[PDB]
Amino acid sequence: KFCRFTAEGVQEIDYKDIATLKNYITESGKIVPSRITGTRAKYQRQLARAIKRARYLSLLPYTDRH
Amino acid sequence: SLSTEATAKIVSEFGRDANDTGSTEVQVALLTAQINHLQGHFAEHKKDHHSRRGLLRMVSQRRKLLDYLKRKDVARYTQLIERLGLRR
Amino acid sequence: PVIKVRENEPFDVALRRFKRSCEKAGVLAEVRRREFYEKPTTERKRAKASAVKRHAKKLARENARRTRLY
Amino acid sequence: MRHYEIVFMVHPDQSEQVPGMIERYTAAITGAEGKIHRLEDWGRRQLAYPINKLHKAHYVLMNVEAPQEVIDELETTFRFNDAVIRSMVMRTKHAVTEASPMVKAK
Amino acid sequence: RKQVSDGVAHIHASFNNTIVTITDRQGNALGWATAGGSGFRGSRKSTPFAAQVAAERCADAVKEYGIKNLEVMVKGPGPGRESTIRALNAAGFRITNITDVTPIPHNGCRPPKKRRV
RNA sequence: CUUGAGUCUCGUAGAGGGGGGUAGAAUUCCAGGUGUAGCGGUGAAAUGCGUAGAGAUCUGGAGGAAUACCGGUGGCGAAGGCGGCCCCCUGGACGAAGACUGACGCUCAGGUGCGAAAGCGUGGGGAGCAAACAGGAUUAGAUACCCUGGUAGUCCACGCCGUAAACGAUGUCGACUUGGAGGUUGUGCCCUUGAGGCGUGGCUUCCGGAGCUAACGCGUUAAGUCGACCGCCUGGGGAGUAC
RNA sequence: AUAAUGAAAU
């Protein structure tokens, strides 16, 4: 399945990249599975870490009702 | 583990040349350095059982290398243990 | 699920939108699963059984298209 | 010496002290034979969720290289200062100098 | 009394009962009704029909404030999630929002044990 | 002597271990506003809470236990086991191209360490739910299953105890013997068509050939064909009991 | 929802 990060040869996923990270969360704020997106496992783990860092810094929400 | 600078210093001190990384003397000296270093770590973290397996393995390896050296050449053995201050 | 009614929109359409959104979020499944305590042994057993059943069904259904019924 | 990335957030009603703060911290780091590789002041941003009944906080970002004691003292300073409301410190493998995504599309 | 013109309906739908409460936009109550108080007991209290009747009675009980627009909050898994909303729209308010506010923990307290009957 | 076994140089993936900080969701309790007859629970009920104002809804405060989504017949560890984010100390594994020592090895009775839940001692802490215990019920009876309450314990520091269907019911090390489909993690080359081909290592899931097996089944991660060392069995009860 | 028992041989 198509994986954008493998296509573009990325080295790190950059918790500061809100524009990219927004494509990988539902409208409730939850992390989208990998069998729906096509991502590889390495990059899926990196992505989860980045989303958690952003949530803590308050650049992303935890839920849709705060 | 030990750092590159300390490793190179010990190799220079104890080997016949900077490329002699496989002699019994060099191996024993490196093991002794790391065993001495870890005493400080284990005096503060007394319930770190998983790290202590590596230390015990180091101790056993040093014992075996010393026995082999004592069997093959007594003079080198005596000089090395004097230089490192090892005995009970 | 937060649903806002658009201008000129009827009520049944908004109700259906709300139902679909709730189903996608999956709140009823969570509430049902969190009603009683489950032991870790039970949890692991359930996971393994589900995986084995799916694999066996796939093998059978893929091998059942090589024979004629009549 | 090791490489660190630092981010800190400041109360909206005290934006007039950010330059003095940056100057003081830069001096503290450079006084011990360190270096500063990236500095950015993002300005006021809307928060994702309230913190202490606030929105609209002020953000600053740094990438530095220094010894450990200096960073420990800096963390203590953050803890006891009252204008700072949140901070984060992370380690990096190498020095970073490029521009961030926040200063390329704002 | 005092006219309000904008309200919120809270719906508490559990496996055994349904509670409907109408409130202003600041959380102050104005009236309420329940399925167990509308003439249904036991095995008839946990049906969609009882919830419908309860919503009708709650709508009737707030007619002196002249409410026009309503928001709707729903909480719980029981039967009575949608019948109440239909009944309100029929009783004649204009619905502007619908939100689900069911509480979910992120691995918090230990639940009770399983029933062996 | 260099092929077994080790040391050195550059990188890579990981819920491996010890210590210290911190964030967001939810349950309970305390103090206030709005409002008024029910709430809660079951196969059906009543013990219980409530006009001394509950249940519901909104604002402020306290406390201590666990980390949704990601999350998979996925990963790490000698076994027991290990899951939010950040820092400090620390153990093992794997790959590419070289240099170095020169059999420095394998197994192990006695011995010494580690070792789930419950339990014991001293000092702390205590939302949630829970042996014992108390009261509704069901029943011919009900010292039970079901309902309403509830303390030891479950949590933390230090010290004991040494057992589990502690299981793959399969000891450790080495060599050899037809295939197919996947997962995860490194690495070399390119016709060139820069997004695709051709190789070469480690760990792991499922099917199946020869052989083997009382059968069920195992099958290059052997229960096949061989070598080195250790532990254990000899009809069912009495008994893993008595001294 | 609950809801027990049946000498030995032929």
| CB-facing half-sphere around the CA of B29: CA atoms within 13 A | 22
Label the pairing between strands C2-4 and E94-100: antiparallel
Q: How many domains does chain E have?
A: 1
CA A55 to chain D, closest CA, distance in angstroms equals 9
Question: Does any strand F atom come closer than 7 Å to the Cβ of B36?
Answer: no
Q: On chain F, which bases lie within 7 A of the protein's CB atoms? A: 6-10, 13-19, 23-27, 33-45, 55-60, 64-74, 77-80, 84-92, 99-101, 103-105, 114-115, 127-130, 145-147, 158-159, 183-186, 206
Contact partners, residue B29, CB within 8 Å, separation at least 6: B10, B13, B14, B84
Instruction: Tell me the C-alpha distance between E9 and E7, whole Å.
Output: 7
Q: Which nucleotide is nearest to C37 (CA to C1')?
A: F129
Phi-psi category of residue D9: left, alpha or beta, with phi > 0 → left and psi -120 to 50 → alpha = beta
Instruction: Tell me the C-alpha distance between E60 and E67, whole Å.
Output: 11
| Residue A24 CB neighbours (<10 A) | 18
Q: Assess whether chains B and E touch, using the rule of 3 or more C-beta pairs within 8 angstroms.
A: no
Q: Resolution (in Å) of the shown entry?
A: 2.0
- Residue contact A16–D101, C-beta within 8 A: yes
Question: Does any strand F atom come closer than 7 Å to the Cβ of D92?
Answer: no
State the DSSP string of A19-60.
HHHGGGB-TTSPBPPHHHH---HHHHHHHHHHHHHHHHHTSS
CB-CB neighbors (< 8 A) of C24 in chain A: 26
Q: Which domain holds residue E43?
A: 2-117
CA–C1' gap, B64 and F222, in angstroms: 36
Instruction: Evaluate whether E66 touches E24 at the Cβ level (below 8 Å).
Output: no
E71 SS3 class: strand
Burial status of residue D90 (CB atoms within 10 A of its CB: 0-12, 13-18, 19 or more)? exposed
CB-CB neighbors (< 8 A) of A12 in chain D: none
Question: Domain spans of chain A?
Answer: 1-66
Which of D7, D100, D101 is the closest to A57 by Cβ?
D7
Residue D55 φ then ψ, to 5°? -125, -175
Question: Domain spans of chain B?
Answer: 1-88
